[PDB]
Amino acid sequence: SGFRKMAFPSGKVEGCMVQVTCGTTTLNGLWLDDVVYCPRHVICTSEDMLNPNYEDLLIRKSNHNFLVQAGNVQLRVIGHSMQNCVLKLKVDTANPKTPKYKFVRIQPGQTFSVLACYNGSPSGVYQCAMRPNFTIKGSFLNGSCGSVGFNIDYDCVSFCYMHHMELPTGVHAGTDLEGNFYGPFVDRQTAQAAGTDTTITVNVLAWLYAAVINGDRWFLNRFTTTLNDFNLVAMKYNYEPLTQDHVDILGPLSAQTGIAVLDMCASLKELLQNGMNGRTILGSALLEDEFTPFDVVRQCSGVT
């Protein structure tokens, strides 16, 4: 029993982190096989970031201008290319610690672990979610760029995020491992404001199921609702619309607890309308939305 915001064990990703320096800029890179992936803004000075022309800036860079250090050993760069907003630095040595891996582009509402790094060294690991506005609420300082987000399915690491920037509002933006930003963000230090950070309804419901499984049941009421009625309330509270696809995904949690998905929706509707009244659910005074239904099953079943 007990329910925690749990990250994946980070070891497989730690063995991939390297330091990439270009000129006076140093950030992190991800070394998989004989390729090091890093944000393309490693070629920029702080001045360049205001209005960078990446193709033009990259012309002034050669393989020897990219310094890649894995631990305390230097890697030889034998090629470089820009793919969208990432650079791919081909090195002469395959990472001997390369885990089985995939590059995946996640959808909003999906969660992943971040291994925050500085100078190619891991500092910490935390769990977060791709917000519906395509930002993440991470913990990143200057030098954290190139830190990655990932999920693990037994022995395969699915890399889904690479850190690139912090918006003026303190929220974070980045790309998948093909260098495409999540959302409309660009790697330029300019006016970029995020859209509405709505609540991930399906994740809140999954977390209410986790609460029932772990003993917190005070919020279960005597009501039910329909998807349309629930969604009228969800819209009012800046919650994402719940679809039949989300109801289907919650099927296994509904089966385990014996609480119909629409009954849990009616409990959530009452929590939105009445508030918590100073009470807590799984040690939280707000409705948590960074656990997917798959995370709740994984944690409550002990998948390794």
Ligand X SMILES: CN(C)c1ccc(N(Cc2cscn2)C(=O)Cn2nnc3ccccc32)cc1
Q: Which sequence positions are flagged as catalytic?
A: 41, 145
Q: Does 267 bind ligand X (CB under 6 A)?
A: no
Q: Total residues contacting ligand X (rule CB under 6 A)?
A: 15
Which residue has 């959530």 as its token pair?
Answer: 268
**276 near a second copy, rule: CB under 8 A:** yes
Q: Which is nearer to a second copy, 1 or 53 (CB)?
A: 1
The CB-of-175 to ligand X minimum distance in angstroms stands at: 12
Distance CA 147, CA 164 (A): 8
189 is an interface residue for ligand X by CB under 6 A = yes
User: Which of ligand X, a second copy, none is residue 131 near (CB under 5 to 8 Å by kind)?
Assistant: none
Residue the block writes with tokens 């800036």:
57
Q: What distance lies between CA 157 and its chain's CA centroid?
A: 14
Identity (one letter) of the amino acid at 243?
A: T
Q: Are strands 100-103 and 156-166 parallel, antiparallel or unpaired?
A: parallel
Binding mask 37-76 for ligand X (x = CB under 6 A): ----x--x-x--x---------------------------
Burial bucket for residue 155 (CB in 10 Å: 0-12, 13-18, 19+):
exposed
- Does 132 participate in binding a second copy (rule CB under 8 A)? no
Q: Based on CB atoms, which residue is closest to ligand X, 166 or 240?
A: 166
C-beta of 13 vs 44, nearer to ligand X = 44
Among 165, 200, 202, 271, binds ligand X (CB under 6 A): 165
CA distances from residue 132 to 111, 203, 235 in whole angstroms, order as listed = 12, 12, 14
Please name every residue paired with 118 in a beta bridge, in sequence order, or none if there are none. 121
63 counts as binding a second copy under rule CB under 8 A: no
Q: Does 44 bind a second copy (CB under 8 A)?
A: no
User: CB neighbours of 222 closer than 8 A, spacing ≥ 6?
Assistant: none
Query: How far apart (Å, rounded) are the C-alpha atoms in residues 263 and 246?
Result: 14
Q: Determine if 94 is a binding residue for a second copy (CB under 8 A).
A: no
Q: Is residue 32 within the footprint of ligand X (CB under 6 A)? A: no
Region 86-145 residues binding ligand X, contact defined as CB under 6 A: 140-142, 144-145
Count of residues engaged in binding a second copy, rule: CB under 8 A: 54
Q: Which of 52, 109, 138, 179 binds a second copy (CB under 8 A)?
A: 138
Phi, psi of 183 (to 5 degrees): 75, -165
Alpha helices by DSSP H, listed for 101-257, are 201-213, 227-236, 244-249, 251-257
User: Residue 49's binding partner, choosing from ligand X, a second copy, none, with beta-carbon cut-off 5 to 8 A by kind?
Assistant: ligand X
Q: Which is nearer to a second copy, 201 or 299 (CB)?
A: 299
Residues 6+ apart with CB under 8 A from 219: 208, 211, 267, 270, 271, 279, 281
Regarding 270 and contact with a second copy (CB under 8 A), the answer is no
The answer to whether residues 53 and 104 touch, using CB atoms and an 8 Å cutoff, is no
Q: What are the residues facing 102 on neighbouring strands?
A: 158
Check residue 180 and report its DSSP letter. Answer: P
Name the residues that contact a second copy, by CB under 8 A.
1-12, 14-15, 115-119, 121-126, 128, 137-141, 143-144, 166, 170-172, 214-215, 275-276, 278, 280, 283-286, 298-304
Name the residues that contact ligand X, by CB under 6 A.
1, 25, 41, 44, 46, 49, 140-142, 144-145, 165-166, 188-189
